[PDB]
Symmetry: C2
Subunit: 592 residues, 2 copies
């Protein structure tokens, strides 16, 4: 029930100072952190950068694999000019679980390590003095929290995780920490939808505030020129001769919201950039601004060698440099909400994102049978609400993914899907498509939930998990056989392939190819391309993965996952040049 | 004028302008005639801090040499009207001109030390303002680090450095928006003495007014243990907790301006360590006991940021250096981000702080009309470095050149001058030195009287007597070590470069150069030599991690002499030092 997830801005009514830097850090295996006073703060631990996953900074494995309570400590200054304002610490992500103490006093908890949350500390600090913030984070996985997984205990006592997902359990203060001072009466939320008529457009907005003061809304273009204004919390901004936002061709207008009448100084100002564009599913078409498009891309994680799962602006800007070069125009934020700065860059660069909530693991290799479904569901729907509230105004969000590879064959999955889909059908004012990925075991013959998603996202791995090597010929025929069945039943919704590919160890070559070589990656991708091109209802290809990424140790995991088109260092495998050639030859309206 | 690191309290603010700026190349040099100083948004987004080179897919951009432009909007709070407003640039590589709201404020030379611009009268308090930076990354023999800029037959400009590392350029370190008091602390100094279990911090405080000064020192739990009034004074610490190698203890210093009656005018706080540094003949003494240096050998180089400071890589580099048993490193070949020293202070490492006086030699140099301006910029960057890093307990010595061409008798006037103009800059009077290249030896070097201790760069078994010849290379190194011993060497000797390129994964039995085994073989050889001579008081191997470099047929995608890979995983040579260095006590050879 987060009152507001607006991204921090700086103006005369709102301040935002980052608390990033080095913190004190201590493990707590015994769980006696609070018994012995760590919540008042400490400086007898190890320095830990923020934001950063804490796991890879340690040379010993038990610390890399640590599972339990852990503590971050820091001092921060509160200016005396802040007295009277609404004061918040905004945590952009604490994986997975956090209790926040300021000066020894408990402020709040939070569940879910991938969305932001703020702590009202207005009453917990001395103004004009140094205060202390302590974070008691937790790490464990259970089937009652997203991402789904288990926590086991080695015979020697140490806890460790057995995830139901691929990626590594990178943990800790994974994203920035802000100190905010906001007006007492302020903007909490706003919403935008768009309509196009001829060369003109209309933004339809609403604004939520914690009070009754008047609301002025003003829309300015790229050069600061005001082009529409309106009064009140509902309204319609008329933009004549609009500059539409276009795939791989962004145009962003600045939106400005202010509280007060013209006898006041503005009691609050908020500011955000939005793109004027519309998204419709029509038949099997995905329409952006009423012309069909064809998705090309990935397939991503937030993973980097030094930050773990933490947001790094350098790695993010290179991922976009690469993705623009290679011809992509879309990617899915698998398998969890990304740092907010990523959606701002997709807006700036004209990319189409599939925003995913962290519901991986709904799949035991009897899931929906059990009793952890009650608590799991609360957290799932709550994480879906907060995700849609945070990112709804980004032009680059195209669709919401509400599961990843859930067990759709279990008939008991249908009551759960009915509930999730019912409870979310109206969260997004733009009413974009809501979907999920179907795993390989989940086909037109075996899935029970094919009626729900607004378009289809298939995860197919012929040539890797099935029909590998010289059997690849049988795998293509068996995929063509499935795609034949969709066609017969007459798919009325678009189909998008969202995973496929091949683990590839850069530098491994063979002629002829063998699984794991660079040549085999290309043969596999060429094979998929031949299938995609032979069916009109296939409307996009998102390969797995963009880069190689870290993973739980295992005998099938050559240090992480290696399915990337690029290495973890962000350099290209042979498959990168394949797609660089294919994707820059496919137009935006491919198949139409 | 002041290089103090920004702090946050009720008198001083500090807000980073890091994030995505706008970016454009200006190969033509038309940017100012085109009105770009007023800000622009028609370029490409570029992270700050970070080198811009590695974000482009084309080589022409990656290698670009000339004028480049950064542009950003920022907000100046109404509440800041009346304070001294500053844009502080932590590093702009290598040249900058600063514009605010289209108005040219300031320029700067040198790409690895911070500078501040007073923008108090160039902004609209309470609205958005524009900052534009016009950077240049050309090299010449008149600027540090030294090199040349050439034009290809196709018009494009290209740099050809006199040093190894790549020409990573742009906004390589954070940008701060500061709010300072009108009367404020500008500088302070610390020196230490010991007596029994007691110590004496001897301070001074530079100010730009006459208001009274008040200094207080508190221990790690916040208890106050000494106060004093006046711009000079001595704090008496009873039963002091000394700052020890790999065993730091940091007191908090608090400078406060204003008399007992008024509102405080300025507060400045820093963390210092109580410890002394003396060169006693051939020993290096920290707190009057002899130490033995072990370490690297470093660069500020990471895959995604390039030259730019990245706190994740830095804490990881420090995690590794403690794991391996090291206790020192040299900031080759330029001052590092200021965070590196604060971590060094908290972890009790000893740093050799190096100014970017690299490439003073060609493949002569001191016999050219470029020295006059070169020397201006050289001694100025020396002054800025010592002024910035003075107060760190962890800075052990200053390095004033890396591999200058000391064979020519003309180097001697220039050294004479550099060494006289730096004589009395560091209040602690720590030792000033420089690295001697392979060609500069006891037989051939002409500047051996100057340094306070000797830093040796030797590459037997790599650039000479490679492969099966290594045994003759070991013999030659002992030859030279015999001649030092003969010459009655009275100052300490520290090996500060040695090693071997190693491609992680290349194995051979028996070894060949470039394999992991050969590297261990080479490092074992150097160890055997170091252990048979008493004046040798330190081994700093080159390099800590594989770092990026100019393209060349001898550069297998950058330098590869690193004990760790560019991703910071170990090569077999990691475990050799992990064994050796964790068995040498801190007083080895005493
Ligand atoms: Cl208070």
């Amino acid at each position: 029930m987060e009152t507001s997830l607006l991204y921090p801005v700086t103006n005369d009514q709102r301040t935002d100072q980052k608390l990033d830097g080095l913190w004190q850090f201590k493990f707590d295996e015994a769980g006696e952190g609070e018994k012995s006073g760590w919540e008042t703060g400490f400086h007898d631990g190890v320095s830990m950068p923020v934001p950063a996953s804490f796991n890879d900074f340690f040379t010993d494995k038990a610390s890399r694999e640590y599972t339990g309570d852990f503590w971050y400590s820091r001092n921060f200054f509160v200016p005396s000019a802040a007295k009277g304002k609404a004061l918040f610490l905004r945590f952009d992500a604490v994986t997975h679980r956090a209790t926040i103490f300021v000066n020894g006093k408990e402020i709040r908890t939070h569940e879910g390590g991938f969305l932001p949350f703020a702590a009202d500390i207005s009453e917990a600090v001395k103004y004009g003095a140094e205060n202390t913030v302590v974070v008691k984070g937790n790490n464990e996985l259970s089937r009652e929290a997203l991402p789904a997984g288990d926590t086991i205990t080695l015979r020697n006592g140490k806890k460790m995780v057995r995830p139901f997902f691929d990626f590594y359990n990178y943990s800790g203060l994974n994203r920035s920490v802000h100190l905010l001072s906001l007006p007492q009466e302020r903007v909490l939320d706003y919403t935008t939808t768009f309509a196009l008529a001829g060369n003109d457009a209309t933004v339809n907005y609403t604004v939520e505030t914690n009070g009754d003061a008047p609301v002025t809304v003003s829309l300015a273009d790229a050069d600061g020129q005001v082009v529409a204004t309106a009064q009140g919390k509902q309204g319609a901004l008329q933009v004549q001769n609009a500059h539409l936002w276009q795939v791989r061709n962004a145009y962003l207008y600045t939106l400005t919201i202010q509280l007060g009448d013209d006898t006041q100084t503005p009691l609050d100002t908020y500011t955000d950039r939005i793109g004027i564009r519309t998204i419709k599913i029509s038949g099997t078409d995905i329409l952006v601004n009423d012309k069909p498009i064809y998705l090309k891309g990935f397939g991503r994680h937030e993973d980097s060698p030094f930050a773990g799962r933490a947001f790094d602006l350098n790695v993010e800007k290179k991922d976009f440099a690469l993705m623009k070069w290679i011809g992509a125009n879309s990617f899915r934020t698998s398998h969890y909400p990304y740092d907010e700065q990523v959606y701002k860059i997709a807006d700036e660069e004209g990319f189409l994102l599939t925003d995913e909530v962290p519901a991986v693991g709904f799949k035991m290799a009897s899931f929906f049978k059990g009793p952890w479904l009650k608590k799991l569901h609360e957290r799932h729907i709550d994480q879906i609400r907060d995700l849609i509230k945070r990112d709804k105004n980004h032009p680059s969000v195209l669709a919401w993914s509400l599961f990843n590879e859930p067990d759709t064959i279990d008939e008991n999955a249908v009551p759960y899907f009915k509930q999730i889909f019912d409870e979310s059908k109206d969260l997004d004012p733009q009413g974009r498509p809501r979907t999920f990925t179907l795993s390989e075991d989940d086909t037109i013959e075996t899935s029970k939930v094919l009626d729900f998603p607004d378009f289809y996202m298939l995860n197919r791995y012929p040539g890797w998990y099935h029909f590998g090597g010289y059997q690849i010929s049988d795998g293509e025929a068996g995929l063509r056989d499935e795609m034949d069945k969709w066609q017969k039943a007459g798919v009325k919704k678009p189909v998008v392939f969202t995973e496929f590919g091949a683990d590839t160890e850069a530098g491994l070559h063979k002629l002829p190819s063998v699984m794991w070589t660079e040549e085999y990656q290309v043969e596999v991708l060429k094979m998929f391309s031949r299938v995609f091109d032979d069916y009109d209802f296939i409307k996009g290809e998102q390969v797995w993965n963009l880069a190689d990424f870290q993973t739980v140790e295992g005998n099938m995991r050559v240090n992480g996952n290696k399915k990337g088109i690029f290495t973890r260092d962000r350099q290209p495998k042979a498959a990168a040049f394949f797609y660089h050639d294919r994707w820059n030859k496919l137009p935006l309206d491919y198949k139409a």
